[PDB]
């Protein structure tokens, strides 16, 4: 693409500069370029990829929710007709969001997942696949909605099965996957009981394994554990 002429190492370096500058669209474009070099990503490189796109799509999602709320209020009894503009603009943001998700899913499919043999990498990328299908599901309202939901579920489930076999209960990737799959259950799949049970069992299993950890690992694991607890507090 436009990054084809730039060295892989330079793309990585610039991704890191973009991160420091909070230039997440640039960060994402640099990491897309790096992925497209065809080489596997290191642990640190995976994190750059994920953070870049998380921030880009997160901004889009937040804008979409503002616009969708305004649209929904426009459809209430007693609201003045204001024309097609709110729908149009919501649709514009939606289409851009969908495009970013499709871009990420395309990187995963060509060829990050298929080349990922270690559980760290494979679980990481399958979690991402679940996340971006989840974001597609958040805006879906038509005949593929069920299929999009199932795609998210499938990816998360595969990642869960690997993570349970291959990673300790306190591994940050395993914990973040469980966190996000629980969010899927609660917010997408109409399965709040499943969400709660997953979050509880994940938390408890991790607590039981903290004793095996160094101080640094302990800090990393207890961080995400707190996110699980935050959702449990909100949902119960």
């Amino acid at each position: 693409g436009a990054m084809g002429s730039m060295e892989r190492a330079s793309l990585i370096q610039k991704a890191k500069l973009a991160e420091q500058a909070e230039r997440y669209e640039d960060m994402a474009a640099f990491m897309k370029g790096a992925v497209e070099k065809g080489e596997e990503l290191s642990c640190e490189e995976r994190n750059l990829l994920s953070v870049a796109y998380k921030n880009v799509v997160g901004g889009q999602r937040a804008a979409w929710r503002v616009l969708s709320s305004i649209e929904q209020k426009s459809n209430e009894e007693g609201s003045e007709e204001k024309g097609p503009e709110v729908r149009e603009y919501r649709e514009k943001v939606e289409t851009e969001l969908q495009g970013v998700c499709d871009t990420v899913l395309g990187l995963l499919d060509s060829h990050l997942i298929k080349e990922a043999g270690d559980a760290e990498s494979r679980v990481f990328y399958l979690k991402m696949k679940g996340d971006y299908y989840r974001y597609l599901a958040e805006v879906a309202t038509g005949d593929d909605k069920k299929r999009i939901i199932d795609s998210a579920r499938s990816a998360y489930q595969e990642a869960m099965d690997i993570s349970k076999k291959e990673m300790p209960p306190t591994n940050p990737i395993r914990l973040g996957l469980a966190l996000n799959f629980s969010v899927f259950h609660y917010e997408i799949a109409n399965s709040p009981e499943e969400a709660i049970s997953l979050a509880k069992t994940t938390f408890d299993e991790a607590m039981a394994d903290l004793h095996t950890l160094s101080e640094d690992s302990y800090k990393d694991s207890t961080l995400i554990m707190q996110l699980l607890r935050d959702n449990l507090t909100l949902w119960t």
Binding site: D131, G176, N180, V183, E187, L234
Partner: peptide, 6 residues
């Protein structure tokens, strides 16, 4: 408060 993800 929204659900939290990572």
């Amino acid at each position: 408060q929204r659900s939290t993800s990572t």
